[PDB]
Copies of this chain bind each other. A is one copy, B any other.
């Protein structure tokens, strides 16, 4: 209902945890589980490569087709581009439907 592509078997969930490393336990054996660990985190890079099939416009309509453009008026900042202080921003949502087709 929200949108997108429903799938019986979507692309799976990818879960990640950093294995615990316990801080030095006590010398005498104790039954209880170890509640003391070492503050820890990890960092890396994730490549996500999707391949998209396409369907291309065959329409023979005469006149020009409406579609999406960038306003030309001198704005203070480039839309869909970083601010002065580094913040990235998206000015307005962008639908998928511009090209026209007959029922």
Contacts and interface: CB of A to CB of B under 8 A. Distances in A.
A15 interface: no
A99 B41 CA distance: 38
Interface string A2-30: 00000000000000000101101100000
Interface residues of A, number: 23
B66 A70 contact: yes
B64 A41 contact: no
Contact of A62 (B21, B43, B80): B80
A55 B23 CA distance: 45
Interface of A: 19, 21-22, 24-25, 39, 41, 43, 45, 62-70, 72, 78-81
